Scaffold this active site. Structure first.
Site, PDB file in Angstrom:
ATOM      1  N   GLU A 213       0.852  -1.118  -0.006  1.00 35.16           N
ATOM      2  CA  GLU A 213       0.088   0.033   0.022  1.00 35.16           C
ATOM      3  C   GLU A 213       0.786   1.299   0.122  1.00 35.16           C
ATOM      4  O   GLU A 213       1.106   1.975   1.161  1.00 35.16           O
ATOM      5  CB  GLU A 213      -0.916  -0.064   1.254  1.00 35.16           C
ATOM      6  CG  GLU A 213      -2.032  -1.053   1.227  1.00 35.16           C
ATOM      7  CD  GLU A 213      -2.905  -1.121   2.353  1.00 35.16           C
ATOM      8  OE1 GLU A 213      -2.590  -0.423   3.310  1.00 35.16           O
ATOM      9  OE2 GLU A 213      -3.953  -1.762   2.353  1.00 35.16           O
TER      10      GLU A 213
ATOM     11  N   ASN B  20      -5.550  -4.854  -1.659  1.00 38.75           N
ATOM     12  CA  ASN B  20      -6.044  -4.883  -0.403  1.00 38.75           C
ATOM     13  C   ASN B  20      -7.443  -4.047  -0.709  1.00 38.75           C
ATOM     14  O   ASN B  20      -7.337  -2.855  -1.001  1.00 38.75           O
ATOM     15  CB  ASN B  20      -5.164  -4.168   0.561  1.00 38.75           C
ATOM     16  CG  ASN B  20      -4.028  -4.931   0.804  1.00 38.75           C
ATOM     17  OD1 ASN B  20      -3.558  -5.769   0.353  1.00 38.75           O
ATOM     18  ND2 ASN B  20      -3.031  -4.265   1.613  1.00 38.75           N
TER      19      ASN B  20
ATOM     20  N   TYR C 197     -11.388  -2.998   1.405  1.00 36.24           N
ATOM     21  CA  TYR C 197     -12.217  -2.946   2.400  1.00 36.24           C
ATOM     22  C   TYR C 197     -13.479  -2.175   2.527  1.00 36.24           C
ATOM     23  O   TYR C 197     -14.620  -2.542   2.894  1.00 36.24           O
ATOM     24  CB  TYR C 197     -11.533  -2.161   3.743  1.00 36.24           C
ATOM     25  CG  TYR C 197     -10.247  -2.933   4.082  1.00 36.24           C
ATOM     26  CD1 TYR C 197     -10.124  -3.945   4.935  1.00 36.24           C
ATOM     27  CD2 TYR C 197      -8.894  -2.414   3.541  1.00 36.24           C
ATOM     28  CE1 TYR C 197      -9.202  -4.505   5.563  1.00 36.24           C
ATOM     29  CE2 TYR C 197      -7.761  -3.218   4.031  1.00 36.24           C
ATOM     30  CZ  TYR C 197      -7.856  -4.230   4.852  1.00 36.24           C
ATOM     31  OH  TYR C 197      -6.727  -4.956   5.476  1.00 36.24           O
TER      32      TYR C 197
ATOM     33  N   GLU D  19      -5.587  -8.561   1.075  1.00 44.47           N
ATOM     34  CA  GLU D  19      -6.165  -8.176   2.292  1.00 44.47           C
ATOM     35  C   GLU D  19      -7.690  -7.820   2.137  1.00 44.47           C
ATOM     36  O   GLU D  19      -8.063  -7.184   1.348  1.00 44.47           O
ATOM     37  CB  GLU D  19      -5.410  -7.044   2.975  1.00 44.47           C
ATOM     38  CG  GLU D  19      -4.062  -7.102   3.705  1.00 44.47           C
ATOM     39  CD  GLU D  19      -3.607  -5.932   4.338  1.00 44.47           C
ATOM     40  OE1 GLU D  19      -4.438  -5.037   4.552  1.00 44.47           O
ATOM     41  OE2 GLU D  19      -2.528  -5.570   4.397  1.00 44.47           O
TER      42      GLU D  19
HETATM   43  O1  LIG Z   1      -6.194  -0.409   8.322  1.00 43.53           O
HETATM   44  C1  LIG Z   1      -6.301  -1.750   8.469  1.00 43.53           C
HETATM   45  C2  LIG Z   1      -5.202  -2.412   7.805  1.00 43.53           C
HETATM   46  O2  LIG Z   1      -5.226  -1.860   6.546  1.00 43.53           O
HETATM   47  C3  LIG Z   1      -4.448  -2.464   5.638  1.00 43.53           C
HETATM   48  O3  LIG Z   1      -4.851  -1.804   4.080  1.00 43.53           O
HETATM   49  C4  LIG Z   1      -2.925  -2.239   5.991  1.00 43.53           C
HETATM   50  O4  LIG Z   1      -2.322  -3.071   5.151  1.00 43.53           O
HETATM   51  C5  LIG Z   1      -2.772  -2.853   7.652  1.00 43.53           C
HETATM   52  O5  LIG Z   1      -1.303  -2.584   8.247  1.00 43.53           O
HETATM   53  C6  LIG Z   1      -3.933  -2.261   8.228  1.00 43.53           C
HETATM   54  O6  LIG Z   1      -4.003  -2.970   9.392  1.00 43.53           O
END
Ligand SMILES: OC[C@H]1O[C@@H](O)[C@H](O)[C@@H](O)[C@@H]1O
Ligand SMILES: OC[C@H]1O[C@@H](O)[C@H](O)[C@@H](O)[C@@H]1O
Ligand SMILES: OC[C@H]1O[C@@H](O)[C@H](O)[C@@H](O)[C@@H]1O
Lengths: 447, 448, 448
Positions: A164, A289, A291, A350
């Site tokens: 990232e 990654n 979320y 992730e």
């Molecule tokens: O913010 C939650 C997670 O975000 C990810 O994109 C990061 O790589 C992690 O280090 C972090 O713990």
């Protein structure tokens, strides 16, 4: 049906400073997070990575836990300062030996080790030489990479270079919320460029001395329209350019996004052509990654993108304040497939969610139904992405363990395994148990 | 409590030729005693035969893929004598031998250890017409048959079994007539048992001459526990024990025939030449145990010929074949066997499993058999206990890989960890199979 | 005096890829160091190359029929690395691998045991451009190459050789430059020897991980006898002995490098990390001896680098390669070797034979080579004598099956028991081949 393709790799992910502890043990050098976390005001509740999950000492137990979760892969980072205390020069034998034992223990357990070279913990000695602002870092990183490339040749076959870039630069140099805590657009532009260059240099070095597959890991937060107002669409494109296209485009040989010229203004710079040749050095795979999504609108006072997210109150939000919206994962996976031409093997390196858990187990259990829900819906979204032709080779849950969520401290739990930070006791959460079933049934449990 | 197994401990599943293959007289294959027996009315439940069975002769590749999905490290199977040598002696049938050739190569390619059994109850009818196991020359016949295999698969099949369960063969086939060739005679039973033992010895010698690897016999044992403190019930127990568990093991260990047999078989009992026992006691490399249950015999004056009968153990679960579920007796038996063989003979559980009702078709792609799962987990734990007590146990084979023909009881008794829809030949891995795959993968740690 | 050999004693014949195959860059095959070396003027006698050789790549079937006529029980051959992996690393060449696939299947079909050698002096040129045996990574490269073979021929090739004659490779290839890659440097010789040993170790480990059967290295030994009672001559003898016979054997047996090497190589000698020696001494299953002759070294101060030179033994016959014929020295060597390996390591003579003049064509369908016949009978007798003295010798391979390319000495040196007319590729079995066939048939009794 939700059975996943043959050979599809299920695993979980961590990072060194977030779990290891023993930051100064056995010769290990000082990192920028050692300094940052021990400076008052920087960390929530004054939390530090001094102990974390005590993984440096309890990795064996943690591997037993990986096996109980039926993990096929474990993605982890190597602490640069633990291996090369001054960032350059003499190697620290014990520090390297830790990762040596760890990798052997993983292979014995039948778990594929996925190693990341840089996960935000630059050696302080290199920061004193300018860190990511010093172009020479491109070489330093490469040399560091080499040390690992040669040491774990034939054992570690899948390599990530940088985890990232956007978080590193936007958090570390633009807004200063992360180590090394600088706040400067000028520095942000330079740091981003040198991070990309370091990635390229490491890939070249990998071509010379390494064996297996190497790639970068990008986080993407898809920006959706707030309205049909043109100022809001311009805002959306500023935000998307600064967060999602800043690094991807030059990695794909398309140069820097035009919008950056507007985003950074006088801080923007022109860079030499050969820099872009180095940066676009061909890779073998890419990690995503992911979320959440955002819905940016125009915000004239928001520095520097002049945009701000609109709260989507119709949906659930995590404790990190991130909207829960699974379709946006599928879309992102589609989008990325297009940006890489369908030609680059992709892996979700992730994905996960933070919800409140108590600090101790409740008679040997942690019931986290929202984390379970997040897991099942987003994995289904992955299946949706594969059904649309995206070349997705694997999925890593963030995170294996409750850990130090950097500047937000231990208050944000991402683990599918609960960690009692008072006792270091581990407890598998309901989400971990469920993930164990998803792996076990290769996705059929979602049916 | 850990349950990780020793290094090199071999996990697998087992089958037998007539129970799964079908195509019994196809491609040159000869007629066996079970071809005749199964096509005689009244002998088989529902008139079931092994004509089709699991159609393994045609679908063996699919079956190997199933073995891979279950993470099997070994596959125990038998070779049909009449398929390889249609008349039992003389001309070999090339297509028949070629089948097992393809099968074994497919197994080795899959990384699965082939465990071969020479004789699993399917004697060629042509040899039965010469007296079968009542003819002493069978010792040579068997040996010759054995030789054909030993040389054909030299270096590929390293682990060999000679005879599978002498007791079932003789007691079922010659004493009570429930199995082929369906004779009912104590006189014939004594002779048949003796010649089966001699045949085993002859095969071991021939293996020493032309073979490569390890050879041994496979015995079934059903431990006999006390029903009461009455002395007549203990005498009953010892009769049953001698007739079933000591009849073959003892002469194999050089102890001669159990004296109680003199009482069990009476005027039908015989004394045999001294050199026969020398042949019978030919040193082996390993021994297989087939184990399912125990019995609790009491005196039964009208029960011919052991004058004993089992007492129903209503405190425990019973299988579809009526066998008590009692895992500790496995541990005990293994210990006992280790003791009878002096601890020097490597042992392997070549058969263990349970029969429960399953529907004739899968239900949404699944077969839920929790009792078979329970049997599996408790008995594997019992294996661990036996090893903890010093038993040199090298492996475990689940009976069975596939739902198959349970001989005279037909297809009504399902022992498979893989369900077979006998209408469509479709295979469905049962919950028991999934769990066993987990036991193999974790090398037992899943039981923790 | 009987000369019957032990049960299972394996009789065969040997070849090497570049020496017989031809078609060196055909069907995807890569460039090797011998492709380069042989096409550089001055390197080869009469400008001979391996472009055609025995045309074995095309005539392997005929050659197998020839093996059958000779009653061979084994055929020792090497696999061309560059034929299978053209660039040494990376993509496999399907046609190249397919050749050896066909060859091995054909050998097994004929009842002939295939004995495969991974490396017989023909390094891929692409790896030589990366430093060859001077680059430590070669240990890994070799291992990967080995794996390709181990898995391709799993269960078919059971006996494996890693390296054929480290001493010829290093002394010829790096020390004096008479062999490919034609370097002349003591510094390079020391490094190359070390990395050849390391490569052997890596291949053995990889074999343990993915392979099946027995694996070992093949050493040439030339026993050094006393020239006089002068102490400088004994020091000379020990230098020569250390440099040729103990250089590789000692670290393979865990004894480190011979002390005398420090004196032989001087400033070019190096100390290597301790773990290298753990790798080098990886336990093997067997060892091959290539043997032809002895030497009688005397002091020679100007002889680089061993400062020794052989004294011509005019009392005995010499081969066309100038090697003394002295069969007792074979026996001695085997005994010596037995002692160095503690008697624990199974030995096989992987090469023994002699070069004498033969005409370029047969003479009425015959080649009369009485001296080669003599060499054969006396040295095989010497083998028997060695076994009587306790050497655990399991087999014997005649070098060579065919008249072939004697490397830098070209086609002028005929080692074959089968004559090759290099104008027509016609094969004619020599009197020596006929005699060897009778030796195999009678298992040594013809020597009586
Ligand atoms: O913010 C939650 C997670 O975000 C990810 O994109 C990061 O790589 C992690 O280090 C972090 O713990
Ligand atoms: O009765 C169930 C099983 O018993 C075993 O001992 C026999 O070897 C099998 O052929 C039979 O199917
Ligand atoms: O030097 C004569 C012979 O030496 C042998 O040891 C090599 O293996 C052969 O390739 C060569 O022809």
């Amino acid at each position: 049906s939700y059975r996943f393709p043959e050979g599809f790799l299920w695993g979980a992910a961590t990072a060194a400073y977030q779990i290891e502890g023993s930051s100064m043990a056995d010769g290990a050098g000082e990192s920028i997070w050692d300094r940052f976390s021990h400076t008052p005001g920087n960390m929530k509740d004054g939390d530090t990575g001094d102990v974390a999950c005590d993984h440096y000492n309890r990795w064996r137990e943690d591997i037993e836990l990986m096996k109980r979760l039926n993990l096929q892969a474990y993605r982890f980072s190597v602490s640069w300062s633990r291996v090369i205390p001054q960032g350059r020069g003499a190697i620290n034998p014990k520090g390297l030996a830790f990762y040596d034992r760890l990798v052997d223990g993983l292979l014995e357990a039948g778990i594929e080790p996925l190693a990341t070279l840089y996960h935000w913990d630059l050696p302080a000695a290199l920061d004193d030489r300018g860190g990511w602002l010093n172009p020479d870092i491109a070489d330093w990183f490469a040399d560091y990479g080499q040390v690992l490339f040669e040491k774990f040749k034939g054992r570690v076959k899948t390599w990530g270079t940088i985890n990232e870039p956007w978080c590193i630069v936007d958090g570390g140099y633009l807004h200063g919320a992360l180590a090394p805590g600088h706040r400067s657009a000028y520095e942000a532009v330079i740091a981003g460029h040198n991070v990309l260059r370091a990635h390229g240099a490491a890939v070249r070095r990998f071509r010379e001395v390494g064996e297996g597959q190497i790639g970068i890991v990008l986080n993407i937060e898809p920006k959706y329209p707030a309205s049909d107002k043109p100022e809001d669409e311009a805002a959306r494109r500023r935000a998307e350019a600064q967060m999602n296209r800043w690094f991807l485009d030059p990695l794909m040989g398309r140069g820097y996004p035009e919008e950056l010229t507007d985003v950074y203004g006088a801080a923007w710079r022109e860079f030499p052509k050969e820099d872009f040749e180095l940066i676009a050095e061909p890779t073998d795979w890419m990690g995503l990654n992911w979320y959440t999504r955002a819905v940016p609108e125009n915000a004239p006072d928001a520095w520097p993108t002049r945009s701000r997210p609109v709260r989507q109150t119709q949906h659930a939000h995590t404790e990190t304040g991130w909207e829960v919206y699974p379709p946006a994962l599928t879309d992102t996976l589609v989008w990325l497939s297009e940006q890489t031409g369908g030609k680059l093997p992709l892996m979700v390196t992730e994905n996960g969610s933070a919800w409140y858990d108590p600090p101790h187990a409740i008679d040997g259990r942690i019931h986290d139904p929202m984390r379970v829900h997040y897991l099942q819906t987003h994995i289904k979204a992955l299946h949706d992405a594969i059904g649309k032709g995206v070349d997705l080779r694997g999925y890593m849950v963030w995170s294996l363990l409750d850990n130090l969520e950097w500047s937000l401290g231990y208050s944000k739990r991402f683990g599918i395994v609960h960690v009692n930070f008072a006792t270091q006791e581990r407890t598998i959460k309901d989400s971990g148990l469920f993930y164990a079933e998803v792996i076990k049934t290769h996705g059929d449990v979602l049916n």
